[PDB]
């Protein structure tokens, strides 16, 4: 894709994670719309972070989304046992890309 | 004082012509069922052109102060003025006067415009 | 020390938005034809265009946040409501219309329905058995022949827009009320959005033919010297690409077929016009161009949006991606009929580095639904003889497509749909702005007691 | 708000799957449609975007020419039509409304608050 | 100088104070899609004097000129004559004093006209 | 209020077309009902004007009378008035 | 119509029972108590008030 997202990241319960979307200067950096959304396995994914920073209703103050450059993070606090699930990136490269998807896994096995 | 519109409204006289200009500024307020405020804003506008024409077609052409040349006639209920500016109020005040305010204004426009700026076009006729 | 001194009627000027109302040419008045679609009570126009021009001025112009093209929009919309309304009803030509190919032999596409149907008479007891000879965008079939009904008779009333009206577009001044000015941007080089240079003021615009069209701005005004590209997020592929011509494109469209106007009485006062047979040649609607002047503009076009995007590159057409019949193709109305050319023809270039006519094929569609008016739909009665216009395209309605992780040919498509563009492309240069003439200001001056 | 979709599909190699997903709780002419395709066990893929007001459609590169989108603003229901049908396309299909209107505070892309349920379509050349 | 409506907007405010006259007479201009134009012809006039009001509560009570009593704050934009009428154009000088005009018509009316037309009534009342 | 509430309800639906004989009978129950709950099947006027639709309602009491086989209703107020349903748009 | 849909009662899904309002009776009696002992101002001293 237009975006390489890490592989599969891990934290422990009630601690922050920091999970990277990597883009060019001319989808990521170029605009200011990366948006976050969150895939349970099986589910429609959902909306958590839109705009570049800000958060859609349904969704609490635990994420937080940023962008450096040409790097955009989405940082979660407090993790807990329902964030067992899929985080993806998403990004205007002039049209519609989305990231390569990370797998997001909280006090368990990799 | 600021006391909002009509603040003064029970105040004395005395003490209520010193509220006329929050009174003054708000007379003016800057389909179906939007007739209404159509319909009124237009009442509104030609109300207060009523209340200024009057205002001008009398020797004032003036704002929230008039003296005219017109002498205070004994049978308008005949009181002394700190019987009057200060033991009542506006609402008081017109209760009683509202036998002659027609007529009022006539002897205040008729007698006064129509001869005291004459009077002053044969002033400045030299 | 220094005093107030109050100063009215001083020059100060502040954005805001009012209802304009409008000044009609009174060349036109004697053209009444019982009230034409627009201009029935339009106050006459200025005799004398007073348009005073300004120095050391400059305005933020906004062509994508102005608010008369919602003014106009509106007021079209609503004009339009109020000009059906009046009419005739067409509720009862919802019956099972038994429908044939028109007398042809083969190579006919459909697009020419013969249809015969009980339609109720003056009288209401007995009834009448009447035919008419329908387009195949204007009915679908219900499932012995063919049964068909017409296509807006389950979403929508039909309306037929009585005919004593006309749909020319006459030039429509929006003029806005005392206490406000309209600001001319009278430059040439001039992108929609910033400071103009040049800006004038005037009472109220020149005259707007209200035009509804896609895919192509027909009697439209032309650019103020050169093509301009014109698009509110450059960046942004959805934001309809505006385009000014600077020389007018002639478009030639003729609806051939001879058609005979039959006046079915369906009620008491109530009338209905159906087309009747087609004496003479059965053709199809086209609209010619000339290929090198439209050749020529498409190079002219590519020139300019080559300055937008990099130095050098290659800009693609293509026929339009999908969508509605009104945005795949190019809609506009003639002589009273609305159709649609599907202009293939007309963007299939590809520009890198370095005498006859183009013809598109044009499918009439007579039961309308313009601006997605959902459960109020008209009908456009057939007009007698041959129908011929010729048009000045002077204007695009592109879009650009989507990019990808590289994108080195980039392809624009036709398309629109939303008849704001179409005012867009008039309403751009104009601003209204309400007067200030109150002014405070310090000076040495000072009241006596 | 709810995106209702079709059920599961089997489809040949070659063949053409038509999905639909009908709309609920808000106005339909008044916010785009997002279709997007994800193959189980892979990443997100976008495929276009409709405009319910005239049905205006754009694709994504990779099914243009193949995908065709066009939508029943009677029903409210918007299609989804895949000719020249691969192994590839085995995947779940859903539906994304928009966060905001199109026509308003909309330059930029952004926002599939609502999805739909999804529809698997197994493409594969067993029998 | 008669350069049309809004002839002289670009202009210094030391020329556009001449110009004055003319901004003003075309403040007034001497079924359905004929509501808009009643609506706009009763919203001109509604608004016309609504800025008549506001001139009349002031110590003007008349056009093109006006002067009063009520000193130029030092925090509104302390500078010069010339700084202000000759390197300036009211554009401009609207848009930086965009900020207090409210307060300084508040402040003009009440501080005048409450004080000065009872301080002429008092000193004719004599 | 009065005039507001007429201004609601003409862009709404006329129901002229809906009072036809209807052929109410008592919703699926058991003893001890009150009525109350009348099945009213009857023929109305689809899209097209030729077809015609046996479409059937569960309307109450207060709203049908018997109009004088099993028993046949009709709408109370459908003499004297014309119906008109408020869109429920609003 | 064309176009034109009367929405009319389907087939009630569930159990058929009929509307109802509650009111609390400990708030209902006082409320009501309340008011005679207002009432009993404007017709004599003592009078019985009957609903
Ligand atoms: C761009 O500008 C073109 C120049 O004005 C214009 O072309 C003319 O369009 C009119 C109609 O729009 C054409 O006139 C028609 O002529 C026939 C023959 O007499 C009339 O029957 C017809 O009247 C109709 O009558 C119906 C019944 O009363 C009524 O319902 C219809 O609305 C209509 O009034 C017209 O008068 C004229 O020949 C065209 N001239 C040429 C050669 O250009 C284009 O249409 C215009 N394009 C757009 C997009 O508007
Ligand atoms: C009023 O009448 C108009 C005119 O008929 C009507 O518009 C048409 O409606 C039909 C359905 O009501 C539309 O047909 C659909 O088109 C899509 C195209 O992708 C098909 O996918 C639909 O179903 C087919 O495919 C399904 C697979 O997912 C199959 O399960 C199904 O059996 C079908 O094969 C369906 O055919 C049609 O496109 C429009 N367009 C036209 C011709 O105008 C309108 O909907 C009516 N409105 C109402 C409800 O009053
Ligand atoms: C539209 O339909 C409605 C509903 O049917 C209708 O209103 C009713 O009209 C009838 C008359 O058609 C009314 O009937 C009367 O009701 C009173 C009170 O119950 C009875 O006393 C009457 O009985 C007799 O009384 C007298 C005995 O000497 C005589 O006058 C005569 O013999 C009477 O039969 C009689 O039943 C009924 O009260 C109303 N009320 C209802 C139920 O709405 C309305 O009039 C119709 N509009 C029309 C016809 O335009
Ligand atoms: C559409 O269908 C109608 C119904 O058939 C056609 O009308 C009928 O057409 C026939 C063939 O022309 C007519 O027959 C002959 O017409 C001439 C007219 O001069 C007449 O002299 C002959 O004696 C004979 O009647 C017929 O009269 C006519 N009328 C009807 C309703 O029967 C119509 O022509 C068709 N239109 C097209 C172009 O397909
Ligand atoms: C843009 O151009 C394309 C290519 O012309 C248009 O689509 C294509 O139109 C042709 C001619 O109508 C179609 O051909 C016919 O298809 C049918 C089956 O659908 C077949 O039975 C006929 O023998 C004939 O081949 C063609 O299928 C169709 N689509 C494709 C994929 O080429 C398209 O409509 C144009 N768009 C616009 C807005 O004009
Ligand atoms: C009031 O009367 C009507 C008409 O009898 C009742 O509605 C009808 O109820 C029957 C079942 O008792 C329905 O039949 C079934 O319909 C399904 C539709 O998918 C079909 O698959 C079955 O094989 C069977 O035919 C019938 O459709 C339904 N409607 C009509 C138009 O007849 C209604 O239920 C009665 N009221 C109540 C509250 O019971
Ligand atoms: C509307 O169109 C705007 C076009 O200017 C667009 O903003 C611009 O977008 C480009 C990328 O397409 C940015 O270019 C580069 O800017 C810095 C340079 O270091 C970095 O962010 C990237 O390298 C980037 O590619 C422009 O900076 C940016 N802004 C300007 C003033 O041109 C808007 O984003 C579009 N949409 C909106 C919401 O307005
Ligand atoms: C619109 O009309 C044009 C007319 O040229 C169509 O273009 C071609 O028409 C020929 C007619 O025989 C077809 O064989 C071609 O396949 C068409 N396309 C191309 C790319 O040459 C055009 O397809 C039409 N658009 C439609 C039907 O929507
Ligand atoms: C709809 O119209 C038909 C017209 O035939 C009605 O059918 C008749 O109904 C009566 C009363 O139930 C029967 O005695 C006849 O035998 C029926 N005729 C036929 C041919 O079926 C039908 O009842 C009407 N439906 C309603 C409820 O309005
Ligand atoms: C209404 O009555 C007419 C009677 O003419 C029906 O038309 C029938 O006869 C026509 C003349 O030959 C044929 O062209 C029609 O196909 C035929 N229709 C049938 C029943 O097949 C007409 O159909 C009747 N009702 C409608 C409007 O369908
Ligand atoms: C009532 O009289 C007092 C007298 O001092 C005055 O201050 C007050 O404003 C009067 N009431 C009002 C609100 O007019
Ligand atoms: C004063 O009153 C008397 C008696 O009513 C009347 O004749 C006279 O004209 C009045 N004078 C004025 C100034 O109105
Ligand atoms: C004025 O006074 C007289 C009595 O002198 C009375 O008849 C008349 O009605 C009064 N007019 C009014 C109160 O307007
Ligand atoms: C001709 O008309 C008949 C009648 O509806 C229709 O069945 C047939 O498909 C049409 N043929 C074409 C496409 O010309
Ligand atoms: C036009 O120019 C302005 C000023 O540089 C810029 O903000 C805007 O995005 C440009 N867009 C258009 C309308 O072409
Ligand atoms: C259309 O016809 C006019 C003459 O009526 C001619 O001048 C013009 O060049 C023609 N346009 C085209 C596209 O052929
Ligand atoms: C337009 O003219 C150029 C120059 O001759 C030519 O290369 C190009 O193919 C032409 N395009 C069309 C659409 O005829
Ligand atoms: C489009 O261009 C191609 C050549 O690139 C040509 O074969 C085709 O016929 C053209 N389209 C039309 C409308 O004929
Ligand atoms: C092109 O034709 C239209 C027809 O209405 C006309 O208004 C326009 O002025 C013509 N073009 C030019 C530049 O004359
Ligand atoms: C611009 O300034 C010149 C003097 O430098 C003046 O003559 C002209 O009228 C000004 N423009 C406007 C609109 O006032
Ligand atoms: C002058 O400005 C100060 C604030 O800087 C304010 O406190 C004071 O009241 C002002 N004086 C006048 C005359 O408004
Ligand atoms: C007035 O000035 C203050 C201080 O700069 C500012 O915060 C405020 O927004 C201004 N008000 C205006 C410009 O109306
Ligand atoms: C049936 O209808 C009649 C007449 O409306 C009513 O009296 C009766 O209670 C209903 N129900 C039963 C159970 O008979
Ligand atoms: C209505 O329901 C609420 C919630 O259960 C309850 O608090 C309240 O007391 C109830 N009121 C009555 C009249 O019972
Ligand atoms: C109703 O409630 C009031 C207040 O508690 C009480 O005084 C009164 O006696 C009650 N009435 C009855 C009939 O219980």
Do not use: G, S, T
């Given at each position: 894709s237009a975006l390489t997202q890490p592989a599969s990241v891990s934290g422990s319960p009630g601690q922050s994670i920091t999970i990277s979307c990597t883009g060019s200067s001319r989808d990521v950096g170029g605009f200011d719309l990366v948006s976050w959304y969150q895939q349970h396995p099986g589910k429609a994914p959902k909306?958590?972070?839109?705009?570049?920073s800000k958060r859609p209703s349904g969704v609490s103050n635990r994420f937080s989304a940023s962008k450096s450059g040409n790097t955009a993070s989405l940082t979660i606090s407090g993790l807990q046992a329902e964030d067992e699930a899929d985080y993806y990136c998403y990004s205007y490269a002039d049209g519609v890309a989305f990231g390569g998807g990370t797998k997001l896994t909280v006090l368990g096995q990799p | 004082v600021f006391l909002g519109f009509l603040g003064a409204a029970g105040s004395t006289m005395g003490a209520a012509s010193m509220t006329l200009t929050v009174q003054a500024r708000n007379l003016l307020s800057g389909t179906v069922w939007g007739i209404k405020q159509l319909q009124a804003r237009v009442l509104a506008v030609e109300r207060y052109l009523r209340d200024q024409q009057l205002l001008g077609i009398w020797g004032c052409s003036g704002k929230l102060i008039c003296c005219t040349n017109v002498p205070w006639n004994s049978s308008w209920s005949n009181r002394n003025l700190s019987e009057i500016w200060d033991n009542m109020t506006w609402l008081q005040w017109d209760k009683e006067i509202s036998n002659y305010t027609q007529i009022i204004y006539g002897l205040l426009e008729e007698s006064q415009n129509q001869q005291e700026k004459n009077e002053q076009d044969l002033l400045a006729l030299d | 020390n220094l005093w107030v001194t109050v100063y009215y009627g001083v020059p100060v000027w502040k954005d805001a938005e009012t209802t304009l109302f409008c000044a009609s040419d009174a060349k036109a008045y004697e053209t009444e034809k019982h009230n034409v679609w627009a201009t029935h009570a339009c106050v006459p126009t200025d005799p004398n265009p007073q348009e005073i021009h300004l120095e050391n001025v400059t305005e933020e112009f906004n062509m994508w946040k102005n608010n008369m093209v919602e003014q106009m929009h509106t007021d079209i919309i609503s004009l339009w409501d109020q000009s059906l309304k009046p009419c005739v009803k067409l509720t009862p030509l919802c019956v099972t219309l038994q429908c044939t190919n028109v007398t042809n032999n083969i190579t006919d596409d459909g697009e020419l329905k013969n249809c015969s149907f009980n339609m109720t008479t003056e009288l209401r007891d007995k009834k009448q058995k009447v035919y008419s000879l329908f387009y195949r965008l204007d009915v679908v079939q219900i499932n012995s022949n063919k049964e068909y009904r017409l296509i807006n008779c389950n979403t929508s009333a039909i309306t037929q827009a009585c005919p004593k009206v006309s749909f020319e577009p006459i030039p429509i001044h929006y003029c806005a009320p005392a206490g406000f000015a309209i600001l001319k941007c009278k430059d040439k080089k001039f992108n929609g959005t910033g400071p103009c240079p040049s800006v004038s003021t005037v009472q109220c615009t020149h005259g707007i033919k209200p035009v509804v069209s896609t895919q192509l701005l027909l009697n439209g005004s032309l650019a103020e010297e050169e093509v301009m590209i014109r698009s509110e997020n450059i960046t942004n592929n959805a934001k309809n690409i505006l385009v000014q011509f600077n020389t007018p494109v002639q478009i030639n469209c003729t609806r051939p077929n001879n058609n005979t106007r039959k006046s079915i009485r369906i009620g008491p006062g109530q009338a209905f016009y159906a087309t009747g047979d087609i004496i003479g040649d059965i053709r199809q609607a086209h609209c010619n161009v000339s290929k090198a002047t439209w050749n020529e503009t498409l190079g002219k076009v590519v020139k300019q949006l080559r300055k937008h995007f990099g130095n050098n590159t290659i800009i693609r057409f293509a026929n339009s991606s999908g969508g509605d019949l009104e945005v795949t193709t190019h809609s506009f109305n003639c002589g009273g009929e609305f159709f649609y050319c599907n202009t293939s023809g007309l963007f299939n270039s590809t520009w890198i580095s370095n005498n006859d006519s183009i013809t598109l094929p044009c499918r009439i569609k007579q039961i309308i639904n313009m601006w997605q008016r959902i459960g109020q739909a008209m009908y456009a009665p057939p007009i007698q003889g041959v129908i011929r216009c010729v048009s000045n395209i002077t204007g695009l309605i592109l879009t650009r497509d989507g990019g990808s992780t590289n994108s080195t040919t980039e392809t624009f498509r036709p398309g629109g749909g939303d008849m704001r563009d179409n005012w867009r492309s008039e309403l751009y240069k104009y601003k209204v702005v309400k007067i200030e003439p109150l002014g405070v200001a310090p000076t040495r001056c000072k009241r006596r007691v | 708000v709810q995106l209702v979709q079709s059920g599961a599909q089997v489809k040949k190699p070659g063949a053409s799957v038509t999905v639909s997903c009908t709309a609920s709780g808000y106005t339909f002419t008044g916010y785009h449609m997002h279709w997007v395709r994800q193959a189980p066990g892979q990443g997100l893929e976008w495929m276009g975007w409709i405009n319910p007001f005239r049905g205006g459609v754009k694709y994504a590169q990779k099914f243009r020419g193949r995908v065709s989108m066009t939508r029943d603003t009677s029903i409210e229901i918007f299609y989804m039509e895949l000719s020249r049908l691969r192994s590839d396309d085995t995947a779940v299909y859903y539906c994304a409304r928009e966060m905001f209107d199109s026509s308003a505070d909309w330059s930029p892309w952004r926002g599939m608050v609502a999805w739909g349920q999804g529809t698997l379509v197994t493409v594969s050349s067993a029998s």
């Open positions: 909306l958590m972070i839109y705009e570049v | - | - | -």
